[PDB]
Design a protein around this ligand. Structure first.
Ligand code: 2CO
Ligand code: FE2
Length: 186
């Protein structure tokens, strides 16, 4: 039974229940993420920005089944075009707006990767991606407003591929945490 999370801590407790088993009900998880109303005081501890690129801040390590983290995007900060390593990936906006651009998996032949679609993700909305859906790029295109997002990945993963938009060629990247549980982890 899905109830509205009252706070980030409550959301975390609910997520531990939803991931207690071996499978994932994507629509239920997205619905509970969306139902949490962002409260900046509750996540300020994790919202550690860097001037030059977006940061990844671990909030909860789940139950062996997922990682929950907060990403902090300065003005103009964005990602590579990337995949999600055979995992579910939910993104909920906590502050600001992000542009998500979708791309198909490239063919083996070298070619420009042309966007398939794009949308603006707005405060409190929860999006979902997985490799079956495609690849994406996520960007804070604002010149004036930093963005903060809450991401849930299941299973957890710490490597992915970045894709060259000009050719479709991929390179393996190791992801790092800027902080864990509020503690900077240089
Ligand atoms: N997947 C990117 C963020 S966009 O992914 O919803 C990352 O975890 O760094
Ligand atoms: Fe992503």
């Amino acid at each position: 039974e899905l109830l509205k999370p009252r706070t980030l801590a409550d959301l975390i407790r609910i997520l531990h229940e939803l991931f207690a088993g071996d499978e994932v009900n994507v629509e239920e998880v997205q619905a509970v993420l969306e139902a949490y109303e962002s409260n900046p005081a509750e996540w300020a501890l994790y919202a550690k920005f860097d001037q030059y690129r977006y940061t990844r801040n671990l909030v909860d390590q789940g139950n062996g089944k997922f990682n929950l983290m907060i990403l902090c995007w300065g003005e103009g900060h964005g990602s590579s075009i990337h995949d999600h390593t055979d995992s579910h990936c939910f993104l909920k906006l906590l502050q600001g707006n992000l542009k998500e651009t979708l791309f198909d998996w490239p063919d083996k032949k070298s070619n420009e990767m042309i966007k398939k679609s794009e949308r603006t993700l707005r405060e409190n909305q929860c999006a979902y991606i997985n490799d079956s859906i495609g690849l994406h790029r996520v960007e804070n295109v604002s010149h004036t407003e930093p963005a903060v997002s809450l991401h849930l990945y299941s299973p957890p993963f710490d490597t992915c591929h970045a894709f060259d938009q000009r050719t479709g060629h991929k390179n393996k990247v190791t992801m790092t945490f800027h902080s864990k549980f509020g503690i900077r982890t240089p």
